[model samples]
Target: AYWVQEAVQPGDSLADVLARSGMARDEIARITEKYGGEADLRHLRADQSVHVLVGGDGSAREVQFFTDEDGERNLVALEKKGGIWRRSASDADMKVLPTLRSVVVKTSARGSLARAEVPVEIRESLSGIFAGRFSLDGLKEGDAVRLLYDSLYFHGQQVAAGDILAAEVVKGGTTHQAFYYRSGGGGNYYDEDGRVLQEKGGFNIEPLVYTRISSPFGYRMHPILHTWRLHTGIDYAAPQGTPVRASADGVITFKGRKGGYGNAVMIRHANGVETLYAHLSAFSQAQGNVRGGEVIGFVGSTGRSTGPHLHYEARINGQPVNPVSVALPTPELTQADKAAFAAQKQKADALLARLRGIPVTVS
Candidate 1:
C-alpha cells in the first residue's frame, strides 16, 4: 500500500540539511541509528536521503524519506517502543458459501411443456443427463431439465434443456426410437419386470401449430438444385423471425456456418438421440445454457434455403429419421426410481406450486 523514497541531490551536510528541511534532529538520529554505524552527524555527502517512521505526536503513521548515502534514498518506519511487525495470515481458506435457489424442470407434452419447480439441492443429481450447451439444431422444446443452478457466482443457478420429447409415431406403421435411453440401470417402466406397459418418458413435438410441412423426410427432389437428394430432415416453412426452439435436451455438438446447412445447429439428446436445426437466422451463444422449452433461434433463409423455414431432422444411432413422423423414446423414469423421483417431485411440486402462486401440499 505504500511506496519507496524519492532521491535527492548533491553536496549537503547531514547537520546543515535540517536548516532548510523541517525535520527535527531526534527524527534524523532515529533513522541513522536504524541504518547502523556512528549515528554520524557529519559523514553525510551529497544526494543522501534517510528513511524514518513518523507517528505518535501530530502525524499519521507514515514512512519518512531522508538523506543517508551519496545520491541514495530510502524509507524507514518508526518502531513504536516495543512493537514488531510480522506476517499475519493467508487468504487460502477464504471462500463464499453458495446460495440456494428454486427453479422448475419441465417436460413437453401435447403442445404443452410439463415442469416441476425444484430446489437445486436435488437438481444437482441430474447434471450430465443432457447437454448444457448446443447449436441451434440441438435444442428441442422439452429436453432433460434442471433449474436453480448457481447464477451470479455459479453457486446456485437454473439448468434447462430441450424437450426430451418422443413417442411411437407411425405414418404407415413403422416405429422408431425417437429419444430413448435403453441402458440397464434398472427396471423397465414402472416395474422391475420387463412386461410393463407404461409409456416411457414422452413429450409433445415442438412447433407452431401453423408450421406447415413443406418437405417430409426421405427422398425428395431438390427445389433449388433440381436434383434428387436423400432428404435427411423435414422442412417446416414459416415466416422469417419465427422463434425456433430446441427439439430435445442435449449438448450442442456443432454450430456455426456450413455450406449447405447455412447457420445450422446440432444438439444431441439423452440416449444417443440427436436433432438438427438448419437455416436458422441466428442462434444463442455457443457453449451456453438453455432450458427445456427455451427458445434457441429463429427461422430464416441462411445457407441453401429457398425461403424462411426450419429444416428439422431426428437421428438415432447415426440414422436419420423423419422429425415429424418418427417414434420418440419412452420416459426414462422406471418403477424403481419413481419412489425417489416422487420424493423429489413432492418437493419439486411444492416449491413449483409456490412459484406459480398455488398452494403447496404436504403429501
Candidate 2:
C-alpha cells in the first residue's frame, strides 16, 4: 500500500492517493490527528497532497508541509502505509516564463546609427510581468543601449512610439536602460514616424559581466581622507588597461585631463546628457569624437585616485544625476528598416518560442 501511494504522481487528490494507499478510514483519521489536519481525510480532492514519514507500525514518524490551507495541501505528498512512508513526485513546474527579446540601436555623431538584435537572459525575477522591473522614462538622446527580449507578442499588439515595452540598455560608465512598450503590426514604433528599435532576450544583470565595481554611484566618505563627499561616478575596480566603452551614443568634446580628471574623455550626447571617463590608462584611437557603443578608453586610476579603476560620471541637463536612475532614449530605425523589421520575423520566432508556450487566459 505504501508502495502504491508513493508511486502516485502529483495532481492526485487525497482521495485518489488514499484509495490506492490501502489505508482504512480509521488509519487515515489517526494519521491526520497527529499531523494538525482539520478536514476530513476521506473523499479528498485533487489539492490535498501531504508529506509524512511513517514508521513500521503505520504511525507518522515525521511530517512536512507545502501549504497552510488544508485544501491546497492535496497537491503534493508523501504517504505512509504498512509501517513506511514513501514520497510522491510532483509535476514539473514549468512556471518560470521566458522573457521577450528587444532590438538594440546605436547612434553616432555623424547622425549615423546602427541597429542590432540581442537576447535578454534571466537577471532577477520580480512580482509580476511588469512590477519592480526597470523603467524606461528617463532615456536621453545620443546614448547606446541594448534591447533584449522576445518579439512574438509584438506582432499584433498596439504600441506607442515612446511606450517602453520591456528591455535593459547598458549605458557605459555605470549606466543601463529599461523599457515597457509592445510593438504593433505596423513598422512604426511611434505615431507617424518615431524611432523605436526592437530586439530579443536572455541577458545577465550583474554590472559589467567582465568587470568589477570599484566604487558604487553614491555619496560616501572620501577614500583618501575620512571626510564625507559626493562621489558622482561609478568606479570600476579593474586592472589598468582594461577596455572601456561609450555608455551611450554621443560625441567626444574633450579627450585630455581636467582638474581632477586625468587623461579624461568627455562625450556630449543629445538632450544635455553627457558622460565623463576619467583617469584612463589609455584612450581608444577609434574614439576621437566617436559614436554610441564605441570604445573610448581603458581602465586606470588616473588622477585623485588611490589605485587603478575607472571613474565615470553622467550629466543630465548639465546636472549630475545617478547613472543608475537615468532613462534610456529609444532610437528610430531608418526608412529602410521597415524591410529589416519584415525580415526579422524568423528571428522573432526564435525569441517568442518560449513565450508562446505559456497558457494565456482571457477575461
Candidate 3:
C-alpha cells in the first residue's frame, strides 16, 4: 500500500536488491522478462531513485525507475494489468504546461525566488525585461513578484525552464510589468499601455533610467530662491553617477560648465535640433560625434544648483522648446498596428487581472 525508495549506489545489482526487497523469486523473474533491456536492470546507476511499491503483505508488488524506452531516460512504473506487468507512469505529469507562480520576498530577492523553485533562466529573463527601466537593488523585504511560464518536468523534477509569457515585479513600491507578444514576426515586450519596452533592436532610443522629474518645463518659482523664472528644461532627479545618454544621434559641441546649468553637454543633430544635458557629474569620451542613446556624461549637481538632477533642454534653431510635452522627432506606432495592439492589450490586461484574482499568502 506504500512505496519505499531505495538509494541506488555504485556496484548494486538489481537481482540482489529485488531479493532483499521482499520480492518473490517468480515475481523477480517476471520483471526481467517483461521489462527486458527496456528497463536496463543490469545497470544500477548512482543517478539514484529506485522505488518499490509494497503490498499489505510487506512484499514488493511493483517497481519504478528510469528507463530509455522513450529516447531520453524517463521514470516508468511497472504495475500489473490483466495479471501482466504493465509499464506506466500514472502519477507523473509529463505535459508542458504554463504554470502560474508567485513569491513575496521576506529575505533577499534572489534567494526568495530560489526558495520558490524558480529556475535561473526564468529569473534572469524576468530581470532583463525591465532593463534600463528600473533598478532591482532597491528591493527590500515585502516586495512581491509573479510570473507565468511554460514549465517542463520529469518525475517531478524540472527538466528546463521555458519562455515567460508574462511577468510582474513590485520593488520599492514600483511595479514593473512585461508581456511577450508576437505574430509570425513583430514580437516584443509591451507595457500596460501597450508601449514597446525596448528599441526594435534598431529603433529604441531610450532616456536614461532615473528616479523622477523634480521640476517641470514651464515657468515656476525657482529652487534656489522663490523667484518667477521660465524653466527651459525638464529636471530629472537620478542617482549620482547615473549615465546620461544622448536622446538621438548627434555631435557634442559644448562639454563644459555653463553659468547656472553647470556641467552641460550640448549636441546638435542634422534637423536643426539641439539637446542639452546639464548638471552632469562627469563626462565620458566627450567626443565630437556619438550615436543615439550613447552615454555622454553622468548625472550631477553643478553650477548654481540645489541637489543632483538632470537638466534636459531642447531647442530648434536656438529657440527654446519644452522637451517634456514634445520630444525630438522619433518613430510613431502606425494606426493599424496600434489598433491591433489595443485589442491584445485589453485581452492581456484581463488575464493580468486574473493573475491578481489569485490571493497570495503573506508571512
Candidate 4:
C-alpha cells in the first residue's frame, strides 16, 4: 500500500534528503559505505529523485536513486537482502505514465504477472482489494486478469507501478472487477455494481486496532517451532492491553484459559459462523449479545505466543478458512450518491470491457 519519493533540492546532501524522506540513518550509512562518497548520490548538482518502496506488509523493499551524469542515465538500486544492504547499477531511458495490461494464468497468478512484467505493488494491491471478498487462490488455469494502473515506464520497460485504477479477475467462469473510485471524501474499492468490497469495520472488523498484520493466514515456517505449519488465523501485532474488537454481532460462546491460546474468547455469530480471539492480557466485562466492534478483551502474549499479538480466526461450522475468502456482506452506495456511482461505474466498466482479451507486453 505504499511508496515514498522525495526530490533532492539544489542545496541538499544525499543523507540529509534521504532522512527527510523517512530513510533510516543505519540504512543511509550502509548505502554510502558500500556505494562510496564519490558516487553520483553524494555529488548531486541537479535535482534528483530518491524513491523508497515499502512492501504491503510494512517492510522496506528497496531504496532507489535516479541520476543522469556523464551523458548517461543511471539508477542506483539499494536493497537489504539476507541482512545486508547491496547496491545494483543500471541504466534506462525512463518515462512516466499510466498503463493498461492483461495476462492469462499459464500456471499461477504470481507467475503470470511476473512473466508479464507486472510490478509487486499492483499484485499486492489486487490481493488487498479482494481481501475478505474473493480469494485469488481460487483462480484456475487459463483465467485472465486485466489491470489499469499508473506507472513510470520507458517503452516496454516499467520503472515502477503506482496506484491501480481498475482490475479484473476471472475465476469460476465469473468476472469479478474492482474499481478504485474517489466519490465521497476518501477512496475505496467498489465492485462493478458500486458496492464496497472490503469495508473497514463494516462486514468484518479486525480483532484489534493493531499496528500491522504480523502474519496472514497461510502455511509457512513456524516462527517459534521452526517447522512448516498451516496458520489457522490472522495475527495482528499490537501493544499489550490494546482493545480487541468483536468481529461481528454475536454471543460469547466461551471465555477462559484455552490451553495454548492462553486467555481467549469465542463468539458464535449468525448461522454456523464463529470467530476466535486468542492471546489476551485480560478479559473485559463483555459477555452475551455482543455487537460488532465491541471491545471484548485486551492483547497479550500469554500462551504459545512469541510476543503481543491477536490471533483471529473465522470459521464456518468449525472449519477454518481465510476470512476474506468468504462472501461477506458488501455495503452499497448511499441514496444521495446513487447517480454519481452509476456514472462512475459505467466508465470503469467500459475500461474493463476494452481491456478484456487485450495483449500482454513487457515493461
Candidate 5:
C-alpha cells in the first residue's frame, strides 16, 4: 500500500486535499458517505492532519483524521475479509494520573497558577473551594500554594485537567487546606479541620410551618408582571401575623425594602449560601446572626403580593435553587459508612502531611 498525508489548508475541501494524495472522486464520495456523521469533512479546520492509504490499483485502503485535541479519532478502512469499507469513531485511550504542584503567589492566584501550567478548569475549582472563607485579593506576594490533583493524558500529551484531590494555601502566615471527599451520590471539599468547604442544609418543610404552598419554585405566570417568568422562591400562604423563621443558621446580610419584594431579609450562610425572606410585614430581629427556627420576620402582604404570604428562596453562590427538592446535608456521616469515611479521611490526612512536609495523625 502507498500512503500519503496532508495538512488541511483554509478553504480546502476534503476532495481537494485527497485529490492531491491521488484518491479518486468515487473513493472519496464513498468514504464521505460512510463516515459523514462520525466526522464531517465539511467542518475540517485548517492545520488538521489527514492520512490516506492506497492499494496498488489506486483504490483507497484507509483514511484517518482527528476531530479534537482531546483524542477523538475517526477512521475509514477497507475491510480485509469483506473488501468493503467500514467507518468507526472513538476516543483515544486516556491515562489519568495524580499530579502534585506547589507555587508561591507572586501576583494573583490565577496568574501564578496559569504560569505554572495549571489548566483553567483546575484553577477555577481551587478558587471555588476557598470562596467566602479566603479572599484571593488577600493573597500576598509570598503566599504558598500546593495542589494535588488529577491530570488527563492521551498519547503522552496532556489533554485536560481532572478534579482537585486536595489543595492548600497560606496567606499572611495563616494556612488553609481543602480536601475532596466522595460519598454515595457525589462529593464535596472540606477544610483541614473537616469543615465542609461547600454549603449544605435544606430549609424545613416550611419556614413557618405554613398551612399550604401558594406557589412552588419554578416558572409561572407572574402574579404582578402578568408574563411567564421564574418564581425563584417558594410562596408560603400563611396568616399575615404568622411567624417567619430563619431557614438555617446564618447572619443577616440584608434587611430592608427591595422594590417589589418590599421588606425583604437576606441571610448569608456558610459556603456562599443565602436565603431571602420576602413580603414580610415586620421584623422580629432585624439584624445580627440567628440560628435556624429563630423568628426573623412576620408574614405579610407588604410586597408585590396578592395577599399575606412568605416568599422564600434558598441560594448557593447567588443562584436560586428549589428549596423543597435540593439535597440537604445530613447531621453527620451515617453509622454504616463511618468506618469507611474514617479510613478515607486518614489517607487524606497523610497526603496533606506529606504535602506540607510535616508529621501528621488523623483523629
Candidate 6:
C-alpha cells in the first residue's frame, strides 16, 4: 500500500534500486530471468523514474520501470502474486491525436517539412498529393504549407503519424489544395475544383505502333552510353518516320532538343503529370495542346541513341515511375456516382473549413 519513487542515478541497476528499498538481492535474479530482455534493464539510464511498491515489512511488493516512452515496448512490471513474484512487459495506453502544422518551403519539400518535424510517412503522402501538378522545382523560398494530419500517441508521446486529411500549399500567390475523399469504397485526393488528383489514363501503351519493344523501362546497359544506367522510359523499335501519338490529352510543355534525347517533346497532362517522347525525327505541332491519339512526333534515332526507336516516359510530378504498371483510372464515373461525389465533395470542403479553425480530437 506504500510507494517509493526513486530517480535512477548514475551507474544504477535493479540491485541498486532494490537495495535502496531494503529488498532482497535475490529478487533481482528473478526479475532478470522473467523480463530482463524485454525490459532492457541492462541499459538503464540516469534520470529514469523507477517506482517500487512496499509492503508492511518494508519488503518490495512490486517494481515498475518504463522500457520505452515512444511505445516500442512501453513498460515492464514485476509484482508479487500468490506469494511469488511474476514479471511482464506490456504496451502503454495508445490514442490517436489530430495535429496541425504550417511550414515554409525552403530549399526543398523534404527539408522544409523536416524543419517543422513532420513525420516521414506524412511528408511522402503530401508530396504525392501535389505530384505532377505543383512542381517541387517551382517551389520557391517562402512558399507556405498548411496541413492537418493524424498522429499516433502512446502515454501522451507521439509514436507515429497517419493520413493527411487536408492540406494547402501557397506559392507565388497561387494556392493549391488537396482534400481527401472517399466514394464507391475507394479513397482518393481531389483538388478544389472536384478534379481527382491522380493520373487519368486508359490509353495505348506505346506512343506509336511499333514492331516490338526495343527496351523496357528500368536499369539496363545503355546501348549508346555503354554504361549501366536507368532507362527512364520505354523504347519502341519503329521505322525512321513512324507517327508518334500523344499518350493522352495534354498540353505540349516542351518542344526542343534535350541532351542525349535529341529532339524531344514534353507534355503536361492531367493530375500533375508529364509525358515525354524522345529521339524524334520531327515534331507534329510546336508547343500546343493535343488530344489523345493525336500525332505529336515521328520516331527516329536522335540524341544518344543507337538505332531508330521512340523513347517515351511518364512522370508523376517530377519522378519517373513504371509506366507499364501505373494504374489507369476507370474510364468514367457513373451519373449516380458523380452526384454522390458532389455531395461528399461539399462535405469535405466544409470539414476543411472547420478544421482550419478548430482541431479535430480523436481516440
Clashes of 3: 1
Model 3 off-target regions past 4 Å? 1-79, 83-98, 117-138, 150-163, 182-363
Candidate 3 lDDT, tens digit per residue, 87-197?
A: 643434344567777777776766787788776656655654554355444457877777777675433444445556677777776777776555411145666656655
Q: Give the per-residue lDDT of model 6 (tens digit) for 1-363.
A: 687767677778766765676667777677777776555666565535577777888667777665532102233556687858765222333455677776766687668787788865566557656663565546767776777777764334454565676777777867787765555112456666556555444343347878877666543333443222335667788899999988778899899898778899988876556788898998886458788788889998988788998888767656554354232232234567567766765754565555444322211
Q: What TM-score number comes out for model 5? A: 0.44
- Candidate 5 lDDT (Cα, 0 to 1): 0.64
Error of 4 at 254 (Å): 22
Writing each residue's lDDT as its tens digit, candidate 4 over 1-363 gives 467777778767678778888767877787778776545566554434577776676555677665433212345566567857765322333344667778778778867886887765566557656764566656668788888877764323344455577888887668888876654012456777777776354346556778887776533433443322336667889899999988778899999888778899999875456788898999999998899888999999988798999888766555554454232334466865666776776765787787675644223
TM values, all candidates: 0.34, 0.34, 0.40, 0.44, 0.44, 0.40
- Residue pairs in steric clash, candidate 5? none
User: How high is the lDDT of residue 22 in model 3?
Assistant: 61
**Better-scoring candidate (lDDT), 3 or 5:** 5
lDDT (Cα, 0-100) at 328 in candidate 5: 29
Candidate 2, residues 108-168: lDDT per residue as tens digits? Answer: 3112111221211111110011112222333234333332332221112211011123333
Global lDDT scores for all candidate models: 0.41, 0.42, 0.63, 0.67, 0.64, 0.64
Off by over 4 Å in 1: 1-203, 207-209, 221-228, 285-289, 325-363
Q: Sort by TM-score, best first: what order?
A: 5, 4, 6, 3, 1, 2
Best by lDDT: 4
The segments of candidate 2 whose C-alpha lies over 4 angstroms from its true place after superposition are 1-210, 221-227, 287-289, 327-363
Count of steric clashes across candidates, in order:
54, 53, 1, 2, 0, 3
- Give me the runs in candidate 6 sitting further than 4 Å from their true place: 1-92, 183-186, 201-363
Q: Model 1, range 71-103, lDDT digits (tens) per residue?
A: 111222233334332111222211223222222
RMSD of each: 26.3, 20.8, 22.6, 15.4, 14.7, 17.1
